[PDB]
Design an enzyme around this catalytic site. Structure first.
Site, mmCIF file in Angstrom:
data_model
loop_
_atom_site.group_PDB
_atom_site.id
_atom_site.type_symbol
_atom_site.label_atom_id
_atom_site.label_comp_id
_atom_site.label_asym_id
_atom_site.label_seq_id
_atom_site.Cartn_x
_atom_site.Cartn_y
_atom_site.Cartn_z
ATOM 1 N N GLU A 160 30.660 14.474 -31.072
ATOM 2 C CA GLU A 160 29.810 14.713 -29.841
ATOM 3 C C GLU A 160 30.117 13.576 -29.095
ATOM 4 O O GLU A 160 30.240 12.515 -29.515
ATOM 5 C CB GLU A 160 28.389 14.420 -30.426
ATOM 6 N N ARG A 175 26.885 18.993 -32.547
ATOM 7 C CA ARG A 175 25.917 19.435 -31.631
ATOM 8 C C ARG A 175 26.425 20.566 -30.645
ATOM 9 O O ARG A 175 27.795 20.905 -30.759
ATOM 10 C CB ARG A 175 25.016 18.390 -31.031
ATOM 11 N N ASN A 219 18.464 15.951 -36.346
ATOM 12 C CA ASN A 219 17.959 14.810 -35.462
ATOM 13 C C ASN A 219 19.038 13.492 -35.583
ATOM 14 O O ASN A 219 20.115 13.566 -36.392
ATOM 15 C CB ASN A 219 16.694 14.542 -36.048
HETATM 16 C C1 LIG Z 1 21.337 6.986 -23.691
HETATM 17 C C2 LIG Z 1 20.356 6.748 -25.005
HETATM 18 C C3 LIG Z 1 19.993 8.021 -25.666
HETATM 19 C C4 LIG Z 1 18.623 8.117 -25.355
HETATM 20 S S1 LIG Z 1 17.371 7.111 -24.629
HETATM 21 C C5 LIG Z 1 16.186 7.858 -24.852
HETATM 22 C C6 LIG Z 1 15.199 7.453 -24.435
HETATM 23 C C7 LIG Z 1 15.363 6.034 -24.173
HETATM 24 C C8 LIG Z 1 13.966 5.357 -23.723
HETATM 25 C C9 LIG Z 1 12.939 6.052 -23.620
HETATM 26 O O1 LIG Z 1 11.851 5.227 -23.296
HETATM 27 C C10 LIG Z 1 11.750 3.922 -22.741
HETATM 28 C C11 LIG Z 1 12.794 7.317 -23.731
HETATM 29 O O2 LIG Z 1 11.491 7.930 -23.406
HETATM 30 C C12 LIG Z 1 11.325 8.575 -24.816
HETATM 31 C C13 LIG Z 1 10.791 9.899 -24.147
HETATM 32 C C14 LIG Z 1 9.382 10.291 -25.256
HETATM 33 C C15 LIG Z 1 11.570 10.995 -24.050
HETATM 34 O O3 LIG Z 1 10.096 9.499 -22.964
HETATM 35 C C16 LIG Z 1 14.113 7.912 -24.034
HETATM 36 N N1 LIG Z 1 16.592 9.229 -25.337
HETATM 37 C C17 LIG Z 1 17.720 9.239 -25.606
HETATM 38 C C18 LIG Z 1 18.525 10.382 -26.252
HETATM 39 S S2 LIG Z 1 19.266 11.310 -24.791
HETATM 40 C C19 LIG Z 1 20.765 12.462 -25.500
HETATM 41 C C20 LIG Z 1 21.372 12.406 -26.570
HETATM 42 C C21 LIG Z 1 22.272 13.317 -27.094
HETATM 43 N N2 LIG Z 1 23.124 13.216 -28.141
HETATM 44 N N3 LIG Z 1 22.821 14.277 -26.159
HETATM 45 C C22 LIG Z 1 21.817 14.311 -25.141
HETATM 46 N N4 LIG Z 1 22.315 15.489 -24.346
HETATM 47 N N5 LIG Z 1 20.902 13.482 -24.568
HETATM 48 O O1 LIG Z 2 24.136 10.903 -47.281
HETATM 49 C C1 LIG Z 2 24.321 10.213 -46.525
HETATM 50 C C2 LIG Z 2 24.180 10.518 -44.920
HETATM 51 C C3 LIG Z 2 23.824 9.538 -44.104
HETATM 52 N N1 LIG Z 2 23.916 8.321 -44.395
HETATM 53 C C4 LIG Z 2 23.724 7.368 -43.367
HETATM 54 O O2 LIG Z 2 22.811 7.533 -42.336
HETATM 55 C C5 LIG Z 2 23.177 6.952 -41.169
HETATM 56 C C6 LIG Z 2 23.387 8.211 -40.189
HETATM 57 O O3 LIG Z 2 24.400 8.848 -40.360
HETATM 58 P P1 LIG Z 2 25.436 9.561 -39.208
HETATM 59 O O4 LIG Z 2 25.908 8.798 -38.075
HETATM 60 O O5 LIG Z 2 26.115 10.708 -39.918
HETATM 61 O O6 LIG Z 2 24.127 10.423 -38.542
HETATM 62 P P2 LIG Z 2 24.286 11.529 -37.143
HETATM 63 O O7 LIG Z 2 23.675 10.880 -35.954
HETATM 64 O O8 LIG Z 2 25.762 11.630 -37.177
HETATM 65 O O9 LIG Z 2 23.651 12.603 -37.708
HETATM 66 C C7 LIG Z 2 24.607 6.305 -41.543
HETATM 67 O O10 LIG Z 2 24.502 4.945 -41.583
HETATM 68 C C8 LIG Z 2 25.076 7.063 -42.870
HETATM 69 O O11 LIG Z 2 25.832 6.062 -43.430
HETATM 70 C C9 LIG Z 2 23.957 7.973 -45.750
HETATM 71 O O12 LIG Z 2 23.647 6.843 -46.125
HETATM 72 N N2 LIG Z 2 23.850 8.950 -46.782
#
Ligand SMILES: CCCc1sc(-c2ccc(OC)c(OCC(C)(C)O)c2)nc1CSc1cc(N)nc(N)n1
Ligand SMILES: O=c1ccn([C@@H]2O[C@H](COP(=O)(O)OP(=O)(O)O)[C@@H](O)[C@H]2O)c(=O)[nH]1
Ligand SMILES: CCCc1sc(-c2ccc(OC)c(OCC(C)(C)O)c2)nc1CSc1cc(N)nc(N)n1
Ligand SMILES: CCCc1sc(-c2ccc(OC)c(OCC(C)(C)O)c2)nc1CSc1cc(N)nc(N)n1
Ligand SMILES: CCCc1sc(-c2ccc(OC)c(OCC(C)(C)O)c2)nc1CSc1cc(N)nc(N)n1
Ligand SMILES: O=c1ccn([C@@H]2O[C@H](COP(=O)(O)OP(=O)(O)O)[C@@H](O)[C@H]2O)c(=O)[nH]1
Lengths: 230, 231
Positions: B35, B99, B11
């Site tokens: 990523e 990822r 997550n």
């Molecule tokens: C561009 C910001 C990334 C966001 S924004 C977002 C989002 C933002 C606002 C929202 O409501 C106002 C939202 O709706 C919540 C939801 C329950 C999905 O409707 C999703 N989900 C995401 C995660 S999308 C993601 C992340 C990621 N690392 N890889 C892929 N393929 N997709």
């Molecule tokens: O052992 C840990 C691992 C992560 N983090 C913190 O949790 C946040 C999220 O880490 P990261 O960007 O690696 O998360 P990702 O989204 O990459 O899983 C960052 O501020 C890290 O410094 C931490 O304090 N201790």
């Protein structure tokens, strides 16, 4: 297999011409255009239908989605024919009803220009287009183009002749804007594509203003000669 | 092919970047593919990436599909390129993905469909493209294994609070449970049937990373090196 893409404006006569060709040689087959199939069942074509209708209603919401799906469907469908067809033929020819370059340099580019796609959508599409063709569509390179040239005014009448319901609103302006781009790329050749070999491709331009459904021999004779030149 | 390919899955803010980065330095034979979206979170990708992220945040119902297509494309391009770029002279080469194309679709894109930010035509169209396209790559990017970094929504929230990004500070705890649930189904119970047959037989290592691991990762790596010696 040789690959020949048949180009031209909406209702210039491509489907018809291509359905005349495929009847003339066991060595000749055709890839029709997916968007063409969509216009009236497998999962692609229900997506195609929905997405088509969505595009008619709100093109500035749906142009990116439509373009990426039309081209994908074309790229996939040209491959289905190039890898499983004309196995037992001496001088194979596969004739594409339009091409991956029509998708980008005519329709998508025209939508970007009427602001149906914003800058970023357009820039995602060109990058998405470069890569999708270069990863998967290499074998698609065209050995020549056939440009079925029809004045903008000829085309407007022919949609009338085709008597499809949703296509009678098309203004000579829309049909004229595609013409100018078709002229620039293939006749006057003033368009720059991101594909180097398209600068050199053989191109056969055919005046298709007069109807040819029962008088097409001279057009077909030009195709035969053009093909020999390859 | 001779390169081992392992996804690191987790997550938001679970600590995948922290882990990846730790891992790259522990060996010269260990390489990582960050990523692409995390970086966005300056090439044309940053430019396009930068915009669709902000547009996406500004209006999920309009840009979800466009974002998902570009993120998965930009990911595939990092991945196939690292294959070509690193580890040509390594005797024990392993490539860690931050990822995978599976999390793109099975965590994020599905989520956005389930939440009505992609309608049915966008989700099946998105699925069409992902299916066919990954099936062009017969085995190329396909995984040797997966490392699940399993944390709580709260830890992730706690960790969101620590990462120090206002642009994320409002991410709701409720969104995490949803995302967290999707991970547990796919990576713990193995009830997510997918359309990439080999996956259900891809070995998964699960690490619980709720305990701070940054100064104290040695145990975690032992379990990684233990996992790598059976793949
Ligand atoms: C561009 C910001 C990334 C966001 S924004 C977002 C989002 C933002 C606002 C929202 O409501 C106002 C939202 O709706 C919540 C939801 C329950 C999905 O409707 C999703 N989900 C995401 C995660 S999308 C993601 C992340 C990621 N690392 N890889 C892929 N393929 N997709
Ligand atoms: O052992 C840990 C691992 C992560 N983090 C913190 O949790 C946040 C999220 O880490 P990261 O960007 O690696 O998360 P990702 O989204 O990459 O899983 C960052 O501020 C890290 O410094 C931490 O304090 N201790
Ligand atoms: C049925 C053919 C597909 C359509 S639908 C369409 C359309 C429909 C309604 C429109 O407004 C009411 C419309 O307006 C475009 C405009 C308003 C100028 O941006 C275009 N343009 C097109 C041409 S887009 C196209 C066509 C094609 N064959 N291939 C590709 N890649 N793209
Ligand atoms: C290949 C181009 C198809 C086009 S383009 C087009 C169009 C383009 C620009 C327009 O204004 C700038 C336009 O306006 C038509 C209008 C003047 C609003 O009636 C229509 N309409 C159409 C018909 S949309 C359509 C709908 C449909 N259901 N099926 C098919 N095949 N096409
Ligand atoms: C990878 C980002 C993932 C998410 S998810 C997200 C989000 C998702 C859904 C939400 O409500 C459903 C949300 O809260 C909006 C709300 C609290 C209702 O105003 C935030 N914001 C984000 C990040 S927005 C962001 C992140 C980031 N790293 N940088 C920038 N510029 N923007
Ligand atoms: O010389 C011609 C060419 C075409 N057509 C008809 O004109 C319409 C449009 O042509 P076509 O569908 O071939 O154009 P495309 O969109 O395929 O370029 C169709 O109803 C054809 O049967 C015709 O009567 N005479």
């Amino acid at each position: 297999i040789k690959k020949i893409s048949i180009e031209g404006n909406i209702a210039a006569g491509k489907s018809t011409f291509v359905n005349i060709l495929k009847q003339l040689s066991e060595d000749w087959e055709v890839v029709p255009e997916p968007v063409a199939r969509w216009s009236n069942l497998t999962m692609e074509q229900k997506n195609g239908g929905n997405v088509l209708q969505m595009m008619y209603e709100k093109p500035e919401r749906w142009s990116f989605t439509f373009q990426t799906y039309a081209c994908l469907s074309r790229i996939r469908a040209q491959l289905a024919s190039l890898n499983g067809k004309l196995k037992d033929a001496e001088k194979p020819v596969l004739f594409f009803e339009r091409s991956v370059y029509s998708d980008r340099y005519i329709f998508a580019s025209n939508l970007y220009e009427s602001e149906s796609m914003n800058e970023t959508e357009w820039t995602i599409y060109q990058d998405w287009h470069d890569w999708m063709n270069n990863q998967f569509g290499q074998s698609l390179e065209l050995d020549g183009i056939i440009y079925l040239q029809a004045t903008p005014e000829t085309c407007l009448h022919r949609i009338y002749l085709r008597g499809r319901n949703e296509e009678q609103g098309i203004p000579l302006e829309y049909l004229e804007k595609l013409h100018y781009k078709h002229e620039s790329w293939l006749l006057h050749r003033t368009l720059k594509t991101n594909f180097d070999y398209l600068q050199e491709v053989p191109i056969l331009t055919l005046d298709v203003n007069e109807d040819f459904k029962d008088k097409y021999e001279s057009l077909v004779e030009k195709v035969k000669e053009f093909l020999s030149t390859l």
